[PDB]
Amino acid sequence: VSVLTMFRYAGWLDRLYMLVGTLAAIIHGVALPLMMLIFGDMTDSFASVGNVSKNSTNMSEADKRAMFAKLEEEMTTYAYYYTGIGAGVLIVAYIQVSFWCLAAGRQIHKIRQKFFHAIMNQEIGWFDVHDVGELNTRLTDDVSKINEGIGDKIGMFFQAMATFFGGFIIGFTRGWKLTLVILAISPVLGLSAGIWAKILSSFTDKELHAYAKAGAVAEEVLAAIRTVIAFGGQKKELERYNNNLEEAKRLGIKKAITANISMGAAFLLIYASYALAFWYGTSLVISKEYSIGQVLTVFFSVLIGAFSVGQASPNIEAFANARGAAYEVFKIIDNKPSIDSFSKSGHKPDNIQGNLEFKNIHFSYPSRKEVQILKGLNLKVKSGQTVALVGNSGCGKSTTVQLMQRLYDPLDGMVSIDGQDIRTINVRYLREIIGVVSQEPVLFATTIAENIRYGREDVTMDEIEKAVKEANAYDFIMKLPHQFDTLVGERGAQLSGGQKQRIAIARALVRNPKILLLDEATSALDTESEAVVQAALDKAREGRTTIVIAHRLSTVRNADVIAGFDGGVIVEQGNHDELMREKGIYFKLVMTQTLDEDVPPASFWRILKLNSTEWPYFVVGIFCAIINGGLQPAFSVIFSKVVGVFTNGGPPETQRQNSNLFSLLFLILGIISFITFFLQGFTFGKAGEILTKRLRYMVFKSMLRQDVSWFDDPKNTTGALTTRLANDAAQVKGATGSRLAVIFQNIANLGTGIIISLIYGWQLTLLLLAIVPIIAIAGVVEMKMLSGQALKDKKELEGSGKIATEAIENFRTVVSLTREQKFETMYAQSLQIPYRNAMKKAHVFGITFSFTQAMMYFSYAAAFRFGAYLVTQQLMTFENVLLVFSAIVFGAMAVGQVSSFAPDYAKATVSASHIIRIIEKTPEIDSYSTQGLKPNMLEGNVQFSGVVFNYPTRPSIPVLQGLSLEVKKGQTLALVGSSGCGKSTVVQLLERFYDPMAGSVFLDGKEIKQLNVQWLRAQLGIVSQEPILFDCSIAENIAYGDNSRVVSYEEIVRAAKEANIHQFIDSLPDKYNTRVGDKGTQLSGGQKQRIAIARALVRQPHILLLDEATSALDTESEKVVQEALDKAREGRTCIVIAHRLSTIQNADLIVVIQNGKVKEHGTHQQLLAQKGIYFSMVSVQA
Ligand SMILES: [Hg+2]
Ligand SMILES: [Hg+2]
Ligand SMILES: [Hg+2]
Ligand SMILES: [Hg+2]
Ligand SMILES: [Hg+2]
Ligand SMILES: [Hg+2]
């Protein structure tokens, strides 16, 4: 079912090219061993010449002619063969790559449109359940994975098995024993991979749990940053994060060490197998004469067949993970379970004037177990009326409105519009006959003309005009620039909410429904605009049967009929007077209410500087890189010598020669290889480990010691910072790894390859390095062109995805239903551009890889043609021919190196650039000295003079302009302003979060500028709006060590005693030792505030600061907390900016701050006796 068959579905003509491409992938994979079968045949003919050169030379003139004639024949075979295979792999590569794009393109585009349709066709279900909107984005990433699954990855898979099965085929066919030997040594290679699976996979996960502790500490500190800053508890958070880092690093070292050990054993088994393969390959020639040394290399090509399984595994994982992600959700992704709504058919009533009927309706939202919110209902409103509903116990009114649009089919009973059931009539038509003005208006990002046009697609500006005129929306739009062509700026949030709703009214007005549903449309709006929108609603009524729910009973007064519920069942119904008459529910309520990142700057060799500072010395790492570096070419020399004594050499000692080279190849390569992998792993493992620690430490610490809009007003976030701390330090660990990688391959290829090249017949080196770097560049340009396509594709789907996410995230598109098909139609038109683009990139993806494989034969071409033949005949021996393989494999060796181990620099360098720019910091105000703390400074009189300030946004209309205040010690400084900030900013400047732009601020009369940054924050009573405690024992929270300040039990006792939180301290288990229970989820606001107050008065500040402390709070809690504050303050300087003017009535100096400039100031009775702003504030506060 869904696992295999369904995944590939449809694609009638697609499947044909799918199979053609598959076939070309097969013959492509087949091509590689055939090129290597040729290699054994070419070796034999090439071999026979050397035998006469060493031994006989009986006749001379004959050999210079005939042997080379034979060589020329081999030149002819060389030429038609490498070429035949080359043209083959060129064509078939272009085809097999054409497979992804051509098949997957149509498959995925079909998936895309069907997915978008099923998504819009599930209706209610999507908003009720699943991941609540955030899911289908991820899902379009899933269809992107689908795109990755059915692509050429499969073609590569068949190619791989073709090289595998075909490799072993040729192996068995031209001899059967060595294949068998290699297969016997083969499972050993699979066992070594077992070290990988147990240790490596586990230790990644092991280390993560360790740093998880470090992440939690870093998570909260950076979120609680202004609090820890204000209290200066930084160095302690420093300490915790350092301990957790200390554990995470030791799990890091075990990971690196073991990893390198594993890869090391892998190479052991590789050189071991390679050698044993030579021992049995050699045993078949000298004392036997089966192989002439032809097949011996081809049987190694059977090892290329062994590499083909390793090349196969990722493609399967690419198919499976794409398959698995798609098919499990594909049944849910696609089709249409639906059938409570759908889109189509049904019954069309044309009578269009009717009576709504609710009959015995029992319903529960499909949250299931929730008790029926509506259990039974009977309500019937005659045509032309306006019915108003009210309730107490909750939901159940909104439910009836929800049911009326058939958003939910009732469990029992029926809703009948006119005489017909609602379930008979067409859903689309039903939605079209029912207009709805919701409590929360919504405007799509488009013109107001289009937002209306979403009400009805086919419409003209005359109807738009009459619409807004009828919605009285024709005023603000005219004054608004661009008129009807006026965009809704910054997505859909631009203008007044009353205007938004009013526009929504015009939109529903174009709909011209005979039923109008108003759910709290007036709610959450200012009273004036409330009355305006209300007027629009009133002009929209009486021509339409309607139902209105709101919490302002003034609008409920003029309703023809009002309905009470209390538990979901209808109880009272009738005219207003009748309801007040009943002294019921209505009368009861009436009387009751009376991660964008990455700046340009780059490291430039500065990485190794921080490394060397934290990497004290390691010459053993680089030395290990040298001996492994020189280890690879030893192989190329040895291998040359193996076949070397077979071609050029005499009959005696050949057996011994093979034994010696076998053993030399085994221990000299394999053992030393184990040594170097375990040694470097032992070096760079601890190197990168401690680098990751010291880096993460000095980062989190460089971060905590700087604030200044990195925290106060950042474009950053807590998560981005934690991410910085983890990932980046891991990357600089790779940055350090690349150094050793570079010196290693430096001596490994260039140095030894060149030195060895000096002993050549010359001439070969130049031609060889005229190839390898070029094909290397071809490998670079392949990845680059690849990323260019990835980016352009992602940008196109980006735009289509943006407008798609716009559709799916807004569920109200269903209330008009006009936009159901309209949105996916436009989106279809959006998806159209990349589709046509796909065939073009089909050729792009297609021709490139073909050309890449076109370099396969050309490498072998220039190699053996010019290598053998013409270079041969003078100064050419058993070496320098196989040394071709040396310098060639050396280039490939580097490839192996670059495409493995540490990250491809890049991200490492960049992450390093950030982690470095962060550790450099911008210390500004940090700790240092800056003052002496005269004992006599305990006064507390805060001066402000000519102070201007702006948060770091220049044209933000700065909150401080020309501001000056004063407060004497031991007295209350009241503060009042319009709302929000400029209130708080004074407090922040006193906290010295930022030193003001101009003017000055004083505490004892000294300038804050000249005051100690720390000691200024040493006496402050700062208590914020929403108090946040360090996660710790509440006793330990109460006492925050400033510097040397010890945890004092009797002191924190005095703290609780003063804060009146001692109530909870007395009771509850452990008393003071009760922890807050995961960020104080067990405590209410009054308690948290009491504790925060205790945090303040432990410090014994001469200055207390309250920023709208009781603003968010309620009932008695405000009084007991205010009482605590009052017993804490008035003995010392305090500033209360709270918006509560009833408790501000007792103050020494009340200050009204307008626009940066203090307007009025004086005691309550003084300003109140006066008249102006303050008097307005109290009069409207009442
Ligand atoms: Hg593709
Ligand atoms: Hg509910
Ligand atoms: Hg090494
Ligand atoms: Hg602000
Ligand atoms: Hg804590
Ligand atoms: Hg106060």
From Swiss-Prot:
It is found in: Cell membrane; Apical cell membrane; Cytoplasm. It comes from the Eukaryota. It catalyses: ATP + H2O + xenobioticSide 1 = ADP + phosphate + xenobioticSide 2; ATP + H2O + phospholipidSide 1 = ADP + phosphate + phospholipidSide 2; a 1,2-diacyl-sn-glycero-3-phosphoethanolamine(in) + ATP + H2O = a 1,2-diacyl-sn-glycero-3-phosphoethanolamine(out) + ADP + phosphate + H(+); a 1,2-diacyl-sn-glycero-3-phosphocholine(out) + ATP + H2O = a 1,2-diacyl-sn-glycero-3-phosphocholine(in) + ADP + phosphate + H(+). SMART domains: AAA. Belongs to the ABC transporter superfamily. ABCB family. Multidrug resistance exporter (TC 3.A.1.201) subfamily. Its main location: membrane. In mouse the MDR gene family includes three or more related but distinct cellular genes. The chain crosses the membrane at residues 12-34, 81-101, 151-172, 180-200, 259-280, 295-316, 619-639, 664-684, 740-760, 762-781, 842-864, 881-902. Keywords: ATP-binding, Cell membrane, Cytoplasm, Glycoprotein, Membrane, Nucleotide-binding, Phosphoprotein, Repeat, Translocase, Transmembrane, Transmembrane helix, Transport. This is ATP-dependent translocase ABCB1. PANTHER family: ATP-BINDING CASSETTE SUBFAMILY B MEMBER 1, ATP-DEPENDENT PERMEASE MDL1, MITOCHONDRIAL. Interacts with PSMB5. GO terms for cellular component: apical plasma membrane; brush border membrane; cytoplasm; intercellular canaliculus; plasma membrane. InterPro entries: AAA+_ATPase (IPR003593), ABC1_TM_dom (IPR011527), ABC1_TM_sf (IPR036640), ABC_transporter-like_ATP-bd (IPR003439), ABC_transporter-like_CS (IPR017871), P-loop_NTPase (IPR027417), Type_1_exporter (IPR039421). It is an enzyme of class 7 (translocase). Glycans are attached at N51, N55, N58.
